[PDB]
Each structure stands twice: as structure tokens, then as C-alpha cells.
Amino acid sequence: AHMFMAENRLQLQKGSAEETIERFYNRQGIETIEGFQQMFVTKTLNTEDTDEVKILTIWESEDSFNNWLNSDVFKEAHKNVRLKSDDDGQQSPILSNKVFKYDIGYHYQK
Amino acid sequence: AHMFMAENRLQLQKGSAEETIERFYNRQGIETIEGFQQMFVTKTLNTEDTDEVKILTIWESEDSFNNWLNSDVFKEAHKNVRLKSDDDGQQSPILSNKVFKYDIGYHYQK
Ligand code: HEM
Ligand code: HEM
Numbered sequence: 001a002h003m004f005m006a007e008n009r010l011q012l013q014k015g016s017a018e019e020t021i022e023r024f025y026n027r028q029g030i031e032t033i034e035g036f037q038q039m040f041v042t043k044t045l046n047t048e049d050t051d052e053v054k055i056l057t058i059w060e061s062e063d064s065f066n067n068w069l070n071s072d073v074f075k076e077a078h079k080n081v082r083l084k085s086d087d088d089g090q091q092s093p094i095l096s097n098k099v100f101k102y103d104i105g106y107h108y109q110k
Numbered sequence: 111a112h113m114f115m116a117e118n119r120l121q122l123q124k125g126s127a128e129e130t131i132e133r134f135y136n137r138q139g140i141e142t143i144e145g146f147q148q149m150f151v152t153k154t155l156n157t158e159d160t161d162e163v164k165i166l167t168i169w170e171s172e173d174s175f176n177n178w179l180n181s182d183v184f185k186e187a188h189k190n191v192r193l194k195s196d197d198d199g200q201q202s203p204i205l206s207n208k209v210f211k212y213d214i215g216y217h218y219q220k
């Protein structure tokens with residue numbers, strides 16, 4: 001069975017990618033979900049308007065990822081996360097997010 | 111130093127994602143490039159009119175990628191690759207591509 005990838009794309013105020021990425025340094029429970037395999041946090045190069053940060057998560061199945069979304073550790077990790085348009089959100093550089101889902105058809109490691 | 115990721119995003123005719131991904135099973139030189147680490151080939155899950163396949167390459171540095179992009183082996187792997195729009199591209203389901211580049215700010219492996 002193929003691996004599954006979920007991407008959370010963050011649209012951010014220009015210049016804020018680096019401080020946003022630093023927030024991902026320490027784990028907050030994702031690693032405890034059966035089926036989680038690994039994660040990458042990327043900054044999109046050569047952007048001219050808003051910054052872009054992608055959070056890529058790789059799982060043994062889509063069910064594993066859904067289990068994480070419904071988990072208590074997901075809620076705990078996101079409790080102090082705010083969008084800029086939230087009532088108490090003005091200081092946040094995070095404008096919006098968009099989730100993308102993928103089937104991993106092939107993988108190769110050197 | 112951070113890892114680097116290059117993405118080649120293919121727009122494909124509806125239904126051709128699976129046949130296109132099978133073309134990546136066999137290596138054609140990239141494993142010989144110093145700095146190359148791994149690759150994922152993904153199909154986007156959605157309801158669009160076209161299929162979308164992404165080729166994600168992970169490298170020790172942007173230089174490693176640049177070296178590959180300019181190499182004889184890159185040329186070899188792509189010598190029979192055509193777009194639908196190419197003079198001899200009648201058989202190809204590949205409509206277009208776009209390259210994206212990313213700095214990898216963080217990685218975690220279970
Ligand atoms: C709903 C809108 C979301 C926003 C604005 C957002 C943003 C953030 C931020 C800023 C962090 C770091 C939290 C901190 O500072 O402690 C975080 C955690 C994280 N987010 Fe999200 N997130 C959202 C939902 C999602 C979704 C849907 C995914 C699926 C890919 C995702 C993937 C991750 C991962 C893997 C972590 C680290 C979790 C851990 O270590 O346990 N997030 N998110
Ligand atoms: C000019 C536009 C491009 C098109 C239409 C295209 C399409 C393809 C296709 C269909 C294959 C399968 C091999 C075959 O059928 O012989 C392939 C090989 C491959 N492509 Fe591309 N590609 C392009 C440029 C790129 C770029 C810019 C990247 C950078 C990420 C890339 C990454 C790869 C990799 C990693 C392989 C396997 C290489 C190996 O095993 O040595 N391609 N390409």
C-alpha cells in the first residue's frame with residue numbers, strides 16, 4: 001500500500017517565514033500517532049508577495065493522518081495558533097492556510 | 111546547512127497520472143550525483159479536470175541540484191520525454207510543467 005502525504009500551506013506576511021519555521025522545532029505529539037512517518041517544513045524561495053511555508057507530513061495511510069486530525073495532541077499543538085483575522089489574532093503573521101492531499105506513487109532513497 | 115528541495119509539477123490529461131508515475135520506477139543516473147538524497151513522486155487527490163503529478167527531489171544543497179540539472183545524466187533521462195505541445199508529442203499526456211524551489215527549514219523522522 002502506498003504512502004500518503006498531507007500538506008498544510010501557510011500564506012504568511014512577507015519576511016515572516018523564518019520566525020514561523022522556528023515554531024516547528026520541538027514536537028508536540030504528532031510522533032505518537034500510529035502511522036506517522038516523517039515531516040518537512042519548507043520555505044518557498046523567490047516569492048515576491050506573501051511568504052510561503054509548507055508543512056509536509058508523510059504517513060503509512062490517509063486513515064493515520066485522519067486519526068491525527070481527530071487526536072487530542074493535534075488540538076494541544078494548535079491551541080495557541082492564531083490567524084491574523086482572528087479576534088485576538090492581529091499580531092500573527094499567518095494569513096491563511098490550505099491543505100493539499102497526495103498519494104505517494106513512488107519513493108527512492110540513495 | 112539546510113537540505114534543499116526542487117519540485118517539478120506536471121499537469122496531465124485526466125486519467126494519466128498512474129501510467130506517468132510508472133515511468134519513474136527505473137533510475138537513469140540521478141543516484142550518481144553527489145548530494146542527491148531522495149525523491150517522492152505524488153498524485154494530487156482532488157476533483158479537477160486534469161491530473162497533477164509532482165516530482166519532489168531532496169538534496170544536501172541547492173548546488174547539488176544545480177549540478178544535476180546541468181549534467182549529462184539529466185539529459186539522458188529526459189531525451190525521450192515530450193510535452194503534448196511538442197512536434198512529436200502526440201502520444202504524451204503531459205500538458206505542461208513548472209519548477210518550484212524550497213529551503214528545508216526542519217525535518218523529523220519517526
Ligand atoms: C488550521 C489551520 C492551521 C494553522 C494556521 C497551523 C499552523 C501551525 C503552527 C503555527 C504550528 C506550530 C505551533 C506552535 O507554535 O506551537 C503548527 C503545528 C503543526 N501543524 Fe499546523 N496549522 C494548522 C492546521 C494544520 C494542518 C491541517 C496540518 C496538516 C498537515 C498541520 C500540520 C502541522 C504539524 C505536523 C505541526 C507540528 C505538530 C506536532 O509537533 O505535534 N497543521 N501548525
Ligand atoms: C522539461 C520539463 C520536464 C518534464 C516534461 C519532465 C518529465 C519527466 C518524466 C516523464 C520522467 C520519467 C522518465 C522517462 O520517462 O524516461 C522524468 C525523469 C525525471 N525527472 Fe523530469 N521532467 C522535466 C524536467 C525535470 C526537472 C526540472 C526536474 C527537477 C525536479 C525533474 C525531475 C526528474 C527526476 C528526479 C527524474 C528521474 C531521474 C533519474 O532517475 O535519473 N524533471 N522527467
Ligand SMILES: [Mg+2]
Pocket residue numbers: 015047
Ligand atoms: Mg523573501
